[PDB]
Design an enzyme around this catalytic site. Structure first.
Site, short mmCIF file in Angstrom:
data_model
loop_
_atom_site.label_atom_id
_atom_site.label_comp_id
_atom_site.label_asym_id
_atom_site.label_seq_id
_atom_site.Cartn_x
_atom_site.Cartn_y
_atom_site.Cartn_z
N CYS A 98 -2.52 8.88 2.95
CA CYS A 98 -2.50 8.51 1.74
C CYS A 98 -3.75 8.59 0.96
CB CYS A 98 -2.03 6.82 1.71
SG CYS A 98 -0.20 6.86 2.26
N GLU A 103 0.84 -1.19 0.03
CA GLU A 103 0.13 0.02 -0.06
C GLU A 103 0.87 1.24 0.03
OE1 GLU A 103 -3.35 -0.11 2.83
OE2 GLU A 103 -3.73 -2.27 2.04
#
Lengths: 456, 456
Positions: free
Chosen positions: B264, B230
């Site tokens: 993010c 990720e």
């Protein structure tokens, strides 16, 4: 120095040679795949794709003899096994053609606030690297789900099955897929690595050897791509004291020697309880004497030659290593005195934990029979492996076989049969046998964008 | 060269230093994890594990203020956001403790003959590498699913949150987990690579930067292990002509400025229809003036400092670069004149496609607002990105927002809400944001053996 060519293993003769695609040609192939993907293939409904993929199944069935004969010619597989390969290849394509709408339906999620669903969308170009041992079925295992998902495929095949490779690309052409939906490619290792770096390649599927897997998985990791690795196995074939002995033997013979043992899920480590060891081994000895070994296209041939000089020489090497390490050569262990790469079906016993082949994958007609003193010792032995692809357990007591199955560290365990292909069944290993699951509903999940769409 | 230490971003003071684990200590950590897994953790029932993990959640909630304060202290998160993180962290642990029995129950397979099922079994030691921005939630996100599935965990956290890392280790200790079920480790990049090579580590979960990702994924591939990645995000936040303008401004502010934009899935690229662009920008300029920027340990502070001088310097750099490139500085754009790594909330406009910040991930309190002439221009602008992590669409017309959602190339799309964490919501991206899904039923399936058991 890589050479794509047909070297017929029955005859030892180079039949056909093929050039590598140039850098420019590789660029054209990727250019075409991207364009068709974005502009055509991903935009077709599931039902339109189903037409094509199902039509390709139909073409394989109709032309099964032609395709099976290419398999036997290029890599030596006995015709009955080649014809079986083609039938299951067709079944796999139909499985995804018919099931894709079920599998690719939106997955609505139960939520206490608003709504949520997962929408299944294609990723792009999938690059597949496939092996010679099942040259149709390995391609179908990847091409069926991915084309149904609206992905496109570039497939680099093993250099010794180029005609199979071309026949599969042609099959899709003949089924009505646009140019670029499915393409063959002939590349060296350098060009393959450069293709992995191409940002249009959105996934890498590999079936093959550990070494090949290590190079490619590291490349895919560095390019930050999704990948799946289906690698070797040294599967346990476990025969408990209350096994149906006659059944275990028949399944052991097929499991080890079908396709001359050139099968990642071959029954490579036969793990047989003390109490039925002698009878199992006597049944094994006898069964291998009934093989009809010869020209894979001859009528009554059950086993053709090895796929290549190398594949034969590796297994003969491993056999002689095992004997020098203390093993007993029960049968075989030698090349047959004829043209072509024919090896005698072989049996080894007394292969100790310190024996050099104990942890090796033997990819050839070579049984290894271990004697164990209990259930627990069989489980322990099966787990004393760096691999974990498939596995088999034999016992008349289904619950006992179930318990054993739960305790063997592998990806798949078959009860009272050998590890055997079917479209419905998820396939994949753990440990050094790789990661990911091909086939079943799970196969189609690997290279899609599962997009969460959340309303609140 | 790496230093594990608490450097308080509010005071700029090194508060505590911690030594690297020695190779011998790393060895013992690994031996103990393996032993504990084999002889204890994997053999405990799902219910026995649940008691432990659910107790861990209990203690998190009981000691909310303690853990939230550690987050504030080490990386500057304002206490309301830190408390929220702790709250959601507990719910993650509760979700998997309560749900695992259902998530991990066998799957019957639809087979032509006999029977087949998939059973879900642990792999072993899972190595997790986690970032500083959500120091607890990122650990629970992997530890919850994996511990419940009967894996054990070695966790290496970012070197600037070591007290958070040690507290999370201590939490499972206090909850009754055996030593070695979950362990913190303090490693330099070299020892980390050597841990990845260890045959006993069966998977690697990383959340972090692209360059961290590239190195670790290459390493995991080369060691033939499953990795989960990720990485960056530069999410679109699309506000259509018919959006509830007040609702869209509210969510934009939270999406971009929560945790100071160090997220993010922050709303990094706001894409607003020309008909509502001025009122949206007006509502945004205004909202940011109502922040209470200060000591993150106070309950009335809304925004603390940046996590580091370097994170702060970079965000300020990207701003100056963006203006030099032709952007308009609407608001902010300077370091605040006080102790700590305090940056003013910033709004940039007129960031064109040739502006050097256009494709950059801005990990800080910097809104970039784009005006578009149409829904399609908005979709096109959202899709003009190397990333594809989260995304948001605002429209009173829900059908229209669903169609836009379908068209944006990203892992997740939220309608009428900003991208936001919930246990039951799967999480992952596509493109350069990495791959795989955690959270929901999907998160628990990353590092398990999906073993097929087939009775023919």
């Amino acid at each position: 120095m890589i050479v794509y060519q047909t070297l017929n293993p029955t005859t030892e003769t180079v039949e056909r040679s093929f050039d590598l695609h140039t850098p420019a040609q590789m660029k054209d192939i990727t250019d075409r795949a991207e364009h068709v993907w974005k502009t055509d293939w991903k935009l077709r409904s599931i039902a339109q794709r189903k037409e094509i993929v199902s039509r390709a199944a139909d073409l394989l069935r109709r032309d099964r003899q032609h395709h099976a004969s290419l398999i036997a010619t290029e890599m030596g597989k006995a015709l009955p096994d080649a014809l079986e390969e083609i039938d299951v290849t067709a079944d796999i394509l139909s499985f995804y053609a018919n099931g894709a709408e079920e599998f690719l339906a939106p997955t609505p999620l139960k939520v206490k606030t608003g709504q949520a669903k997962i929408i299944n969308q294609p990723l792009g170009i999938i690059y597949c690297i496939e092996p010679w041992n099942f040259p149709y079925y390995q391609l179908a295992r990847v091409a069926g789900p991915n084309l149904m998902a609206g992905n496109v495929v570039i497939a680099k095949h093993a250099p010794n099955v180029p005609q199979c490779a071309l026949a599969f690309e042609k099959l899709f052409h003949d089924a009505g897929a646009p140019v670029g939906a499915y393409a063959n490619i002939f590349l060296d290792n350098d060009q393959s690595a450069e293709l992995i770096k191409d940002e249009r390649i959105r996934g890498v599927a590999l079936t093959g050897s550990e070494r090949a897997g290590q190079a490619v998985a590291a490349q895919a990791g560095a390019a930050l791509k999704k990948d799946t690795m289906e690698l070797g196995g040294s599967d346990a074939f476990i025969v408990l004291d209350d096994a149906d002995l006659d059944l275990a033997v028949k399944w052991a013979v097929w499991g080890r020697f079908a396709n001359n043992g050139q099968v990642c899920t071959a029954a490579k480590r036969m793990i047989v309880h003390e109490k039925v060891y002698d009878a199992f081994l006597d049944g094994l000895k006898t069964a291998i004497t009934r093989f009809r070994i010869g020209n894979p296209l001859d009528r009554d041939t059950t086993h053709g030659p090895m796929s290549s000089l190398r594949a034969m020489e590796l297994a003969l090497d491993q056999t002689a290593e095992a004997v020098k390490g203390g093993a007993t050569l029960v049968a075989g262990g030698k090349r047959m005195d004829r043209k072509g790469f024919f090896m005698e079906p072989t049996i080894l016993t007394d292969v100790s934990k310190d024996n050099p082949v104990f942890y090796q994958e033997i990819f050839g007609p070579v049984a290894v029979v271990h004697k164990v003193a209990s259930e627990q010792a069989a489980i322990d032995l099966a787990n004393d492996s760096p691999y974990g692809l498939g596995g088999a357990v034999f016992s008349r007591d289904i619950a006992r076989a179930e318990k054993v199955a739960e305790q063997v560290e592998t990806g798949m365990v078959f009860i009272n049969t050998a590890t055997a292909a079917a479209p419905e069944l998820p396939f994949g290993g753990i440990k050094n046998s790789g990661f990911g699951r091909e086939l079943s509903f799970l196969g189609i999940e690997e290279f899609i964008n599962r997009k969460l769409v959340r309303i609140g």
